[PDB]
Every structure is written in structure tokens, then in C-alpha cells.
């Protein structure tokens, strides 16, 4: 079963949770079209040129637009960008570990 790539905007539901094992859990809400769809996600450097982080959640998907999705990721130490969704209105979250 193939799913479309989410084209629309995402919103952070609550404050990003930090786990004791050096990971972060981001709870997002989809505002766009095409659900069920894959959540575009990437942890990058501040220059947005290299992939630095690791996604822990296997294939983040919006099952229903009305239900938020928990995304677990492992950011690198120091400064990084959490990039959620495609442009326009792409979430670009600053993160410091």
C-alpha cells in the first residue's frame, strides 16, 4: 500500500519532549490535503545542506488529518534544524542538544 507525500502545512501540538536516551518526541498536526500521507522529515545542519540527525519513528504517516502524530528523532549534539513538511510553510525548528 503506497501513500502520497504530505504537501501541506504541519503544526506542533505541544512542547517537544526530551527522552532520557538522547531522543526527542515531536507531536505534529497536519493542516493540508492528501491524508493518509507521509510526513516529510529531516534533521539538518543550520546551513540546510547535510543530514545530521536520525529519525527513530518508522515511516511517519498522517493516518487521519484530525489525529496528531508523534515523531521520535535523535538530533546531533549542538545546533541542528528540524525540518517538517515541504515548502511553502515548511516547519524549520531550531534545536540545541
Amino acid at each position: 500500500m503506497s501513500y502520497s507525500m504530505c504537501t501541506g502545512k504541519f503544526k506542533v501540538v505541544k512542547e517537544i519532549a526530551e527522552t532520557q536516551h538522547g531522543t526527542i518526541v515531536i507531536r505534529v498536526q497536519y493542516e493540508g490535503d492528501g491524508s493518509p500521507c507521509k510526513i516529510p522529515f529531516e534533521i539538518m545542519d543550520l546551513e540546510k545542506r547535510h543530514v545530521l540527525g536520525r529519525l527513530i519513528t518508522v515511516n511517519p504517516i498522517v493516518t487521519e488529518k484530525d489525529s496528531p502524530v508523534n515523531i521520535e528523532a535523535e538530533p546531533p549534539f549542538g545546533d541542528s534544524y528540524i525540518i517538517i513538511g515541504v515548502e511553502p510553510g515548511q516547519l524549520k525548528l531550531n534545536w540545541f542538544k
Partner: antibody
Amino acid sequence: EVKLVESGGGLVQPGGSLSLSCAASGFTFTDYYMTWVRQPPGKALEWLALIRNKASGYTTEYSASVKGRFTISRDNSQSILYLQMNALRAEDSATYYCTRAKWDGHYFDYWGQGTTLTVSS
Amino acid sequence: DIQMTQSPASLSVSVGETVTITCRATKNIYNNLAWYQQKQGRSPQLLVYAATNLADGVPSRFSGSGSGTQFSLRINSLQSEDFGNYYCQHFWHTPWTFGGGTKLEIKR
């Protein structure tokens, strides 16, 4: 079960107005995005307008070809989709289809039989 | 905006042969792509959605492939009922543009 029946097609003078309707049945109307697609004789299909479901606040989108002239609307009590067409021109002559989208606007899974519009003097 | 180009414009293929038709997007659309069939004097019908999923009631002889900018529709051991027009459509940002179409005709 799922059925879409368009009506309202006919002959209109250039600059005139016409309203098309699409009677929907066999599904929960408010749960689905609805669309209008047209096809001029011997030409390709053209997406014109969309109307979102209840969850998305029934918002609309239009192609640049019809923006400002056409209005998509829905009667959620009667499960009817409408297309209000103003300032009609010869290039609006086509078969008009009303469609249901499968995944929140994506993939036109059900189409009506179509209704024909002719814009001419 | 993203434009959709289909190839070939027309083709004649015999019953029982396998056919592949292609669709190209001007920009990356991942797998947000649909294929439709339209027979003489009838409404278009959904064949493939999300580039590879078969729509309800579509025979398994149909198969969609591709991700990004290049897509293919394959018909294995094609039948007389498969002849007609084929359109691709993207589902990225609006407008959701259709390709110009490919006319599949019967070789006899």
C-alpha cells in the same frame, strides 16, 4: 452504491451565467472533498475547482482559468454540489464532470456521467 | 506550477501484448500521481493512485510504477476493453494538472 449525477448543462450566450448541480449519494458527503473537472471536445481533462470536507472547513481552490468567474459550493443537507458560472466564454464549452476525491482531495475515484455546456452566440 | 507530459501521443497494440505508457512531471511530485482511463463517449475512471495502488475493480493486469518525475503505466496481456484514452494527473500543490493523454488503439 456511490453515484454522482450532474445536471444543468445547456446553451448559453457569451457573457451569460449558468449553474450546474451534482446530486451525490452512496457515501458520507461531508467527509469528502468534491471537485469539478471539464473536458472540451477532443481535448484533455482540466481540473477547475475543489471544495474541502467538513474537517477542513469546506474551503475552496480554483484553477487560474476560472478564478473570479466560477464558484464551487455544496449543500450539505441535500448532498448536492454546485458550480456557479458567470461571464461565460466560448472556451468554457466542454463536458463538465463532478468528482469525489479518495484521500482528502487526492485521486478522483468517482466521476459523474457529465453535463455539456455550449457557450455561443 | 507543474506540467505533465505523456508519451507516446498515440499507439496501436495487439490484444495479448504488453504495453507501457509514460508520464513525466516538470518537478518532483514523489508518488502523488494518478492514472485514469477514458473510453469513447464515457466518463474518465480512476485506474492507479499514489503511483502504484490499483483502484477498486481495476484488473491486476494494470500496474503503475515510478516516483519523482518519471512514471509508467503497464498493461500486461491487454484486452479489447483496455483500448481508449489514458491520462496522468499530479496531486502536489494546486492546480492538479493532467497530462495531454495517450490514445491506446487496437492493432489488428
